[PDB]
Amino acid sequence: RRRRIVVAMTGATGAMLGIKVLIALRRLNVETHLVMSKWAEATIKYETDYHPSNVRALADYVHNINDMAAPVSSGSFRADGMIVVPCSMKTLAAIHSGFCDDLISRTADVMLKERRRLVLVARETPLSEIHLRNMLEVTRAGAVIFPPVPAFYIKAGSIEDLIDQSVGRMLDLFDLDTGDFERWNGW
Amino acid sequence: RRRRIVVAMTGATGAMLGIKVLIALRRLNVETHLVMSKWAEATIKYETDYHPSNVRALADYVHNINDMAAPVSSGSFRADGMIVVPCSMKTLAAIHSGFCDDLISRTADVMLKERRRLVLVARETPLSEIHLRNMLEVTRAGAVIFPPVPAFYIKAGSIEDLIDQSVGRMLDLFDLDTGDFERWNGW
Amino acid sequence: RRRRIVVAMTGATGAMLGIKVLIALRRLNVETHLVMSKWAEATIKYETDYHPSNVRALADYVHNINDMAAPVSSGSFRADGMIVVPCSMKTLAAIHSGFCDDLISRTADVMLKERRRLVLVARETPLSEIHLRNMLEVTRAGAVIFPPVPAFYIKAGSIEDLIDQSVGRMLDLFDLDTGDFERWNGW
Amino acid sequence: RRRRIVVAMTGATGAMLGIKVLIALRRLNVETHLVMSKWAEATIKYETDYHPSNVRALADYVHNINDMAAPVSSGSFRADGMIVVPCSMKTLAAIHSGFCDDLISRTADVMLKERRRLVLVARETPLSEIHLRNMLEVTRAGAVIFPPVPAFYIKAGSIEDLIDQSVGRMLDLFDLDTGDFERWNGW
Amino acid sequence: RRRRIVVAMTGATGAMLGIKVLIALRRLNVETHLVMSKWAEATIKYETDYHPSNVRALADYVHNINDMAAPVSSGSFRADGMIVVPCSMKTLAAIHSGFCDDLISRTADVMLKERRRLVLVARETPLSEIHLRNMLEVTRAGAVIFPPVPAFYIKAGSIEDLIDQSVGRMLDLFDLDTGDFERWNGWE
Amino acid sequence: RRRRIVVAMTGATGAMLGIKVLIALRRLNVETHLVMSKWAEATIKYETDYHPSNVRALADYVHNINDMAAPVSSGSFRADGMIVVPCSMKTLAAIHSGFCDDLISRTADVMLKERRRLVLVARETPLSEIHLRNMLEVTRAGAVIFPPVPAFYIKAGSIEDLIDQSVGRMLDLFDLDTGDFERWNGW
Amino acid sequence: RRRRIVVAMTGATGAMLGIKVLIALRRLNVETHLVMSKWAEATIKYETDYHPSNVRALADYVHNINDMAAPVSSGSFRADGMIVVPCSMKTLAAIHSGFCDDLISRTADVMLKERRRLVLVARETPLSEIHLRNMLEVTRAGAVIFPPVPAFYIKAGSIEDLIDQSVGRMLDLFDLDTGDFERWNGW
Amino acid sequence: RRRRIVVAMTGATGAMLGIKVLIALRRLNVETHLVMSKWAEATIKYETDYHPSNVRALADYVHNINDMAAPVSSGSFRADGMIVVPCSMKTLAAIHSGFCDDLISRTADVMLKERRRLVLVARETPLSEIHLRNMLEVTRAGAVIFPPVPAFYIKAGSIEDLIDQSVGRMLDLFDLDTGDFERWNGW
Ligand SMILES: Cc1cc2nc3c(=O)[nH]c(=O)nc-3n(C[C@H](O)[C@H](O)[C@H](O)COP(=O)(O)O)c2cc1C
Ligand SMILES: Cc1cc2nc3c(=O)[nH]c(=O)nc-3n(C[C@H](O)[C@H](O)[C@H](O)COP(=O)(O)O)c2cc1C
Ligand SMILES: Cc1cc2nc3c(=O)[nH]c(=O)nc-3n(C[C@H](O)[C@H](O)[C@H](O)COP(=O)(O)O)c2cc1C
Ligand SMILES: Cc1cc2nc3c(=O)[nH]c(=O)nc-3n(C[C@H](O)[C@H](O)[C@H](O)COP(=O)(O)O)c2cc1C
Ligand SMILES: Cc1cc2nc3c(=O)[nH]c(=O)nc-3n(C[C@H](O)[C@H](O)[C@H](O)COP(=O)(O)O)c2cc1C
Ligand SMILES: Cc1cc2nc3c(=O)[nH]c(=O)nc-3n(C[C@H](O)[C@H](O)[C@H](O)COP(=O)(O)O)c2cc1C
Ligand SMILES: Cc1cc2nc3c(=O)[nH]c(=O)nc-3n(C[C@H](O)[C@H](O)[C@H](O)COP(=O)(O)O)c2cc1C
Ligand SMILES: Cc1cc2nc3c(=O)[nH]c(=O)nc-3n(C[C@H](O)[C@H](O)[C@H](O)COP(=O)(O)O)c2cc1C
Ligand code: DMA
Ligand code: DMA
Ligand code: DMA
Ligand code: DMA
Ligand code: DMA
Ligand code: DMA
Ligand code: DMA
Ligand code: DMA
């Protein structure tokens, strides 16, 4: 019935990106399935005013990071995509290597084998050859690398305006239209 | 005598990153050599309150984008590094491919052959396999890929605070200390 | 203004190598930051007369293996080098793959992206194609593989004499001279 | 009816490893064929109390390094394996490249084409990309790389104890049990 | 306390390039360690008015090509870099393959493993796929390929002027300024 | 009925090499088709006594650098080979990449697809990994890389002697004998 | 005026192939330049009735294996091709690696760079991955691998009949027709 | 109880090699399973005095080339190895590509997956890059390439003497000793 998208958050800086993804997906009437890593919860508390319990309330369903029996861990579970936002280099490497020992990496591993859209908001700078090799080869395996670089051409008035443009551009990859930002139409 | 760094700006969004790099380098008593692409001047006018003539005044020397006889185009010219900020995918590809048909790509080509530090603030999202292949292989050739992703863990109060942290992290790669941002020291 | 070097120990045999690196680095007035793996602590207990607390007293600062918020885990933290001594195949693989899920592998991951010297005293024999592929490719990413093979040409009288020579050659890679071993100068 | 093993010594430090291999193999009733390089003889004289004449007496047969007509140089010659101990980087590269211009490299070249066990006690530190590429690719061709790294977990009392453990683990690869060292069996 | 640079000469044409490197480094108070191959000595005799004994006098220390126990053959030996000038395809291949069976190739092999600057003035034309593969892959291992192609834009009045510029550009890679050639500064 | 050879000059130093190639080819009764890049004309003026109009007078036919409709730009046009002398790194990369947006790179692109001899006098030092990758891979596509390195073994009396020898060796690749230099015949 | 072909013999079994190549080329009015390795001379003596001096008399010119100043060692020397018959794995590896430390490997190295026909009668069985890697990659560099495998379909009456057929097929690669063997034209 | 070896003959010249393999294996008390391709039967008739029915009588079991249900086509069937003698380039390519559309290529495909010894007496000269790519990559997959090149150093008196030596060296790869040829033991 309703479209399903798995939203995974990891311990890279940029926790507000994952929070605003859940808000935008809820408004778009998308059934969300949230998984938060241990260090994702730590960065949520430290960088934002949200508590992990507040972020869990923004999602239709929540699954435990270590619960490999969760419904989303099986390819038979029907879902239409997954976004890891923000995505740490550790989780990027787990997905690239195939070492799927938690629910985030396993569900991403499953999305790739089932040929479902997987978007990794990989946040790190500068990049080593390890990071770039992982990005290139996971891209060839089917994933989409979305570095959250600001779009300064929108003449933003606040940090939130840039984050809203980024979140809207992320969800474009699932053929979803937030209508929350100004798309380019020339000068 | 004074350290020399070539500062190149291209037509990717984020012109304020290159402007604040020139300001920080001037304060650090670094002799700067500025080159601006045609579309870099266009994005400076459109996203910022600066005019190209204002940015040129922030640099000790300015060289024309099409002047292949400029001093910085020769490896015999002594310089200590180059940063392309912001760096478009087009200029990243010119450097990766070796098609050095303007002063920015030629000077970058020269920095790589002379084994001088070259930093590319490559701004694009999402990334295709073309972008990532260019990033990986130019990295193996010696360049440093620095995607300008914000560091939200600093609890920034403004867009300028995030840009200042990014610029300071860029210049760390030249062993320069702005002292303009708060470095991580735990929670 | 002292030089900072991260000393990481893992659960490969040869715990005395890491202990003597700390002792050396202290005598040369280097500020050492020690991280010990869980199995490093076990190997320290089993094959040396030291206790992990004795090892911690040899370092200027100690960080917990699971504390991903430690200062050394960020590239903004300035450091001059990192040595993993001894380095197990497990940790070598974590660094090669990029699966940086503890402080040793994350700090090493940061050293590579910030282009700082990383020395892996990788101890294992014989070597599989997995080990050698990881060594070769992590070398291309910037790390130095240092197998702790004895230099019998020094005509040592004890195991400790051979360890001292190995430790001295390790620290040569950071441009540090222990002056504790006979450098080669003909027969 | 006796098993034949070619024992080759090259000019890497650690000549005692090859001497003890000859002693251990004689104990095990293996017919040994010794080949010593020119710089192996110099190394034997420098760092051991053995003269090359003493080492030749430890072997059943001795062949000249320059004698490409020696029996071991033909694949039609029955042999069960070969160990280069210690193995220099030069000889590792001769075997990797295929430039078989002396009896050691040619016999190793023959062992690989006849699909016989070839162990290279490659001793060098630190390792360059050249060394590791040669190790990885000669491994894929069928060779076993055995860095002589000490097993400190045996809680040794002398340098000789650690050499004995290494020699025993080397000969494990030929399915031989010296019985002179303590194998791991838990704490 | 002085900087040490190993200067290796091989049997590629261009022996004067190595001779002028030794002279320039002496001028810069660099302690030079010279190794000459067998065919480098033949090339010196044929192409120059120097005898190998004259070239050896230009260096602070000279090591035998066959002496694998020379000080420079160990990584424990302190040194800031090595330049092979001129560098034959044979020696380029020895370094690329790792077949380090003489003092020049072994010392270069050691420079690469110790992460020290290694410059190969590789002289050959035209180039085969063998040469180019060796150049590309040894570059990735850390070496610098410096083909001695003349910089005609200096408007030289003699062969020696072009050689002096090449030698100065070589030593730039060791952060050394001979001050004996005109660096580019736009159109004169 | 005469052989046709395209002579292309680019903005690398060494303009006299291309001028002498034209003179040598004229003496050998070869119909030459000249294309000069914009920066080739500037280098001709700067480092030689020739004017570009003098160089055009040495050729049988001259085509404009931006005229993609020139006869030599089509494979249907009969031609026996092409030499780019001197060849910049920029034009080397244009040919390697296939970005054939001027008459020199397009004609070279055509020579490769029609399996005609293409000689690139690629002049640059030192060489980066970008340059060498382009040289290796364009060689595999069919091109011949000819770095203009002097042949001191001819015991030359002037710069012109060494240039004459290089030019003669260049034209050897087209099975042409200038007879203007001394070929090697032993000591 | 006459065609020049370098004939190189190495220390693989099959010296009679090289001798019969020299006889066939003399009959075809080809100027032959012979180079014999040290182990080719030993092989000639052992498995043929020829003395090396008899083989030298079959050639128009002879050059010493260690004479790097011989005429054929330079690309400036006019020559139409080279055949190494028989070709050892050692010499195959010297050519593949580029380690051209004798006149045979240097002349072959020169033939490849000058784009002249090079035929390697590589004789070894079985083949290792080293041998096949060298064969494949030297082929891509321009060489032709000619294993001297007998053509039994000619219905030979002696060993010499099969040798004559191999020699004729070898020289087919130089566009030469010995005319002393029966080519295939159906049953 | 008895050793089983699959003997496959294909349509390359050298049918007598396959016949003599069958005779040698019968003498060695090895249970042989013969498969002949269509063009091997034509080759047997043309260059030997045997009829295909005579060759079938030399084997213990015979299977039809198109019978994909034969016992040897399954990995569950116990067998100790397989030799394809002689091996055409077509069959070499079928095994390399995996296009196992007859019993010879499928049985070889099975031998590789079950990790059993597979020897390909690949006969062709000269070799293309296609042939050598197939040889190299099928070798890495487990097969042994055995070019039937004669060993002239045995000082043979007839064609059959050289064939007997090749056959004995072939079966050396199955740890079998025909004992009817002189192995090398010096001059
Ligand atoms: C405050 C803080 C910020 C961090 N930011 C990043 C980051 O931007 N990128 C990254 O790759 N890792 C970052 N890390 C490190 C990761 O949290 C660490 O590698 C962790 O093991 C990743 O775990 P996870 O992917 O399972 O959530 C940060 C850590 C902390 C404590
Ligand atoms: C307003 C604007 C913003 C742009 N932002 C980017 C960008 O973020 N990344 C990118 O690769 N190209 C961007 N482009 C496109 C580049 O300007 C374009 O590819 C141009 O050819 C690059 O030229 P240059 O690198 O020589 O300056 C942008 C263009 C415009 C007009
Ligand atoms: C006594 C002992 C000795 C060990 N020696 C080695 C070794 O030499 N090399 C290795 O790769 N692993 C060795 N291991 C196994 C590692 O401890 C194990 O793989 C562990 O997962 C490594 O974890 P760490 O790198 O986080 O310390 C040893 C284990 C024990 C108990
Ligand atoms: C005293 C001494 C110790 C050496 N130790 C090593 C070593 O440990 N590893 C290495 O690759 N080369 C070492 N070498 C250099 C080799 O001996 C040199 O490369 C030589 O050419 C190897 O030749 P071979 O393999 O034929 O014996 C050493 C040389 C000397 C004089
Ligand atoms: C006069 C002369 C000039 C030579 N020039 C070159 C050259 O320019 N490039 C090259 O690769 N080899 C050249 N050689 C060949 C090398 O000397 C030969 O390959 C030798 O084996 C190299 O040995 P080395 O590198 O140890 O000195 C030349 C030889 C001679 C006699
Ligand atoms: C005086 C001068 C000398 C130059 N020499 C070289 C050179 O030797 N090699 C090179 O790659 N570029 C050299 N360049 C830079 C090229 O001219 C520049 O990259 C240009 O874009 C090449 O354009 P073209 O290949 O279309 O002629 C030189 C430039 C100048 C002004
Ligand atoms: C009698 C005899 C036969 C040989 N046959 C071969 C052979 O068929 N293939 C091979 O690669 N090496 C063979 N060799 C070994 C080579 O002679 C040896 O590797 C030598 O180093 C090659 O040197 P060269 O290529 O410079 O002549 C044989 C050696 C001897 C003594
Ligand atoms: C008389 C004759 C001799 C042949 N010799 C060879 C040969 O030596 N090598 C080869 O690859 N093909 C040779 N062929 C071609 C093969 O028979 C042909 O490619 C066939 O398709 C192979 O089929 P098979 O491998 O299934 O037997 C020969 C063909 C004929 C008629
Ligand atoms: C947790 C669980 C039962 C996973 C199995 O589903 P899958 O994605 O591995 O595919 P399949 O339905 O074939 O088992
Ligand atoms: C613009 C110009 C004259 C470039 C030449 O310098 P380079 O970097 O190509 O090196 P070199 O000094 O050897 O010519
Ligand atoms: C604990 C912590 C702050 C980790 C992030 O380090 P970083 O190097 O990724 O920081 P940045 O790239 O934003 O400078
Ligand atoms: C001394 C000698 C005979 C060397 C050739 O060995 P080989 O393995 O090539 O012999 P063959 O392949 O002929 O059995
Ligand atoms: C001549 C000689 C003794 C060389 C050893 O140098 P090395 O670098 O291989 O030894 P180590 O690594 O122990 O310093
Ligand atoms: C100026 C022009 C006609 C270019 C097309 O040449 P082409 O070789 O691509 O065309 P064709 O394949 O028909 O020769
Ligand atoms: C003995 C000798 C002169 C060797 C040089 O040959 P080469 O082909 O390398 O010289 P060049 O490239 O100048 O023609
Ligand atoms: C004719 C037949 C039964 C073929 C199956 O062989 P297999 O080795 O593919 O079967 P399995 O894997 O079940 O042993």
Residue numbers in the entry:
A (entry chain B), B (entry chain B), C (entry chain D), D (entry chain F), F (entry chain C), G (entry chain E), ...: 39 to 225
E (entry chain A): 39 to 226
Which sentences did the original study use to describe this structure?
In order to understand the DMAP versus DMAPP preference and any mechanistic consequences, we here determine the crystal structure of the DMAPP-specific Aspergillus niger UbiX (AnUbiX; also called PadA1). We determined the crystal structure of AnUbiX to determine the structural basis of DMAPP versus DMAP specificity. Although AnUbiX was crystallised without any exogenous addition of DMAPP, the crystal structure reveals electron density directly located above the oxidised FMN that corresponds to a bound DMAPP. While the majority of the active-site residues responsible for DMAP(P) binding are conserved in AnUbiX/PaUbiX, a significant variation occurs at position 181 (PaUbiX numbering). In PaUbiX, F181 appears to block binding of a beta-phosphate containing DMAPP in PaUbiX. In comparison, a Gln residue is present in AnUbiX at this position (Q203), establishing a hydrogen bond interaction with the DMAPP beta-phosphate. The crystal structure of the DMAPP-specific AnUbiX reveals a similar interaction between E162 and the DMAPP alpha-phosphate is established, as part of a highly conserved network of polar interaction. We also reveal that the N5 alkylation process occurs when using DMAP in the DMAPP-specific AnUbiX, and is thus independent of the presence of the DMAPP beta-phosphate. However, in this case we show the ensuing Friedel–Crafts alkylation of the flavin C6 only occurs when using DMAPP.
Originally thought to be redundant but distinct decarboxylases, it has been shown that UbiD is in fact the only decarboxylase, whereas UbiX produces a cofactor strictly required for UbiD activity. The UbiX enzyme catalyses both the N5–C1′ and C6–C3′ bond formation to generate the fourth ring of the prFMN product.
